[PDB]
RNA sequence: GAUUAAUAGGGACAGUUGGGGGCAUUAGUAUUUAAUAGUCAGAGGUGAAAUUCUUGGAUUUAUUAAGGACUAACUAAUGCGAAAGCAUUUGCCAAAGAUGUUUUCAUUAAUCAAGAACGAAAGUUAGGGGAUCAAAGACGAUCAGAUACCGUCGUAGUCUUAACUAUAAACUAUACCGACUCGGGAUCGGCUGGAAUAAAUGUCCAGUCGGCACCGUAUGAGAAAUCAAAGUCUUUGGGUUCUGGGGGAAG
């Protein structure tokens, strides 16, 4: 027995992104700095490609399937 | 009527398999139909052994003759024949590996 | 699933619920119509430009915050890609396809793929014809794919 | 080969090295994959060669390999060892003597070189070389 | 003054996956056949033998070469391709799914007479190529009979280029698109969390999309075999294409 109308938290949060209700993704946004000029750049959690730092010009993040890892010790808050 | 899922082969996905030569009549054969048991044959008999172990003659690592090594491939048609597989009863037929 | 019996699957892509713009990001509708308008003219897709804007300067749906989307934008700013992402990127594979067949002319299973390719721009020259986005006598052929090559 | 003969002596030279069925039939499990990679080597000796290798992928779990156990390589990653394997080889051929090159491609040094070049790819086991063959070789 | 953005569809993009395809290239044994040596009377083939081959040397052993096809073992209810079909290496050429997306476009779509693209074999035309097997044929044997099931040989083909042919138990004999409904693990591809080692294009635990497939079971279906769909049809109606109407004569 379960209510569809007040799922569960943990429930929701296994399924796939579009199994459920209200539906929303996964994907989230990330304020990057640097491991040298510091400079605090925001990054989407699924960048499809390779990003700069507009500062200097080293590298922060690699793109992938979903994922993107990111260069080196760079830091990272998670806004929201 | 039906008699079979698999109709005795395994070609699940696509629609055709390379066909193979049978080790015993020689017929061609899909592969993933005809039986198969590649065993691990020994040269000489049991008792046999024993006698050529003393008549040996190089060193002796305790590894003993070479085992023979039998690729083995079937057709039905002869496959059971030889009583490799004998006609199974009804409920039997999906048992795998017995 | 188009031109598919049996294959048929989901890519991804939900636009989050709440239809206001982030909170942290502060840009008048203007700000980003300048980066969007100015990307644009380094010669940009509105299908790539968006994706910058996301990637690189966190604005997740310019539609949300502007109240514009992308290729409106770029319209009202004469910044239009005058032949639509859609038409133009198949009619560009479509021909890549004819030339790997030249020095390939029997390549077959490329023969087919072409023949789909080239059945779907008939579709959309269909379509976008009748919506007064493309001159009724546009004509996709060989002639109309290699003078975009020039 | 017979290379030269010093009165009721014959004297030979490196022509050919190999395996036996004993081996090959040996390690060849239904579960795993099989690996092989032929190299072109230049030995600084003006001999050429031909070098085969053998591998299979290894297991790690403790679940001794079954129709449940897969031990599968993405073809990706056995090319991926191929062009690593047959590298590492051609280097260090062009780097030794025929004299050397021999007595190390009957030792397990290789064996452990290609392990460890390996277990960045795919973990392998029963690394052979199966067969190497005298191409052409100078007389100078 | 321009509805959302369809767990509809088209494009962009991102790592990745595949025995998908086209050009190159590249091996590997084996079958033949040839050289170089080596002996010695039998080889080969069958239930038995027989035509067959052989001291102008067979079968045989070692090295090597030429040649045409073929890709073993790993290769499994595993993978890809619209289907037919597709497995040596490496390198190019254009292509594809799935997954990932807080990217665009916003009905663009489902199926389809006409009308086209493909479509193993076998077969056909004109050239190549010709190793193995081999329809027709020539022979042995077997039979009361054997131009048949075994055996010895052998032409077309089988391989290829360029044309043409379109059928096959072209089979899941089960049209495509869509929504639902039982349980369960294991798979192949992608992704996301985590743990151990270790810091591995690896392993495992847990999710989850998408793909073959299986196990259990139905107060659901059937003539039954059986079917997780062959189900949600007398409680008879999601959309669309094709087909049948006793049998034989007959495709
Ligand atoms: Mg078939
Ligand atoms: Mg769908
Ligand atoms: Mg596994
Ligand atoms: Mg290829
Ligand atoms: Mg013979
Ligand atoms: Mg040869
Ligand atoms: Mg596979
Ligand atoms: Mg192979
Ligand atoms: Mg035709
Ligand atoms: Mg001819
Ligand atoms: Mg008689
Ligand atoms: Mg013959
Ligand atoms: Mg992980
Ligand atoms: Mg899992
Ligand atoms: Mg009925
Ligand atoms: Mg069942
Ligand atoms: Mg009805
Ligand atoms: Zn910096
Ligand atoms: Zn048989």
Redesign the interface.
Same mark, same amino acid.
């Given at each position: 027995e379960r209510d569809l109308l007040n799922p569960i938290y943990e429930e929701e949060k296994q399924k796939n992104? %579009?199994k459920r209700l =209200? /539906?929303?993704?996964n994907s989230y %946004?990330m304020d990057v700095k640097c491991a040298q000029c510091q400079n605090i750049q925001? =990054? %989407?959690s699924n960048? /499809?490609?390779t =990003?700069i730092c507009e500062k200097c010009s080293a590298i922060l993040c690699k793109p992938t399937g979903g994922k993107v890892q990111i260069q080196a010790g760079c830091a990272f808050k998670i806004?929201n | 009527p039906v008699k079979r899922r698999n109709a005795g082969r395994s070609q699940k996905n696509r629609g055709h398999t390379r066909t193979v030569p049978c080790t015993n009549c020689g017929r061609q054969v899909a592969k993933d139909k005809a039986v198969k048991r590649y065993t691990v044959r020994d040269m000489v008999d049991p008792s046999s052994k024993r006698d050529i172990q003393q008549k040996l003659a190089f060193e002796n690592e305790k590894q003993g003759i070479p085992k023979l090594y039998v690729k083995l491939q079937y057709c039905i048609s002869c496959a059971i024949h030889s009583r490799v597989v004998r006609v199974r009863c009804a409920e039997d037929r999906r048992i795998r590996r017995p | 699933m188009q031109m598919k019996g049996k294959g048929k699957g989901?890519s *991804?892509?939900?636009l $989050?619920?709440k239809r206001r713009s $982030?909170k942290?990001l502060h840009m008048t509708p203007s700000t980003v119509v300048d980066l969007s308008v100015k990307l644009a003219k380094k010669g940009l897709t509105p299908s790539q430009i968006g994706?910058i804007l996301?990637?690189?300067? *966190?604005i997740?749906q310019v539609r949300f915050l502007t109240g514009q989307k992308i290729l409106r934008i770029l319209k009202k700013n004469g910044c239009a890609p005058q032949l639509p992402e859609d038409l133009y990127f198949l009619i560009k594979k479509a021909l890549s396809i004819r030339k790997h067949l030249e020095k390939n002319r029997k390549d077959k299973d490329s023969k087919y793929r072409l023949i789909l390719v080239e059945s779907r721009i008939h579709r959309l020259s269909r379509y976008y014809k009748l919506n007064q986005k493309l001159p009724p006598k546009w004509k996709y052929n060989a002639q109309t794919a290699s003078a975009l090559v020039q | 080969v017979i290379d030269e003969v010093d009165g009721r002596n014959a004297k030979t030279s490196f022509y050919g090295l190999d395996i036996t069925r004993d081996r090959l039939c040996s390690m060849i499990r239904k579960w795993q994959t099989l690996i092989e990679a032929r190299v072109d080597c230049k030995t600084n000796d003006g001999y050429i060669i031909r070098v085969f290798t053998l591998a299979f992928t290894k297991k790690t779990s403790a679940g001794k390999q079954s129709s449940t156990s897969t031990c599968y390589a993405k073809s990706s990653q056995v090319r991926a060892i191929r062009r690593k394997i047959n590298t590492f080889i051609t280097n260090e051929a062009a780097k030794l003597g025929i004299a050397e090159f021999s007595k190390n491609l009957i030792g397990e040094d290789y064996t452990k070189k290609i392990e460890k070049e390996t277990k960045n790819i795919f973990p392998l086991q029963n690394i052979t070389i199966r067969k190497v063959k005298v191409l052409k070789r100078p007389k100078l």
């Open positions: 992104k %579009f =209200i /539906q929303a993704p %946004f925001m =990054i %989407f960048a /499809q490609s =990003i806004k | - | 989901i *991804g892509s939900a $989050p619920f $982030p942290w994706v996301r990637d690189q300067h *966190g997740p | -």
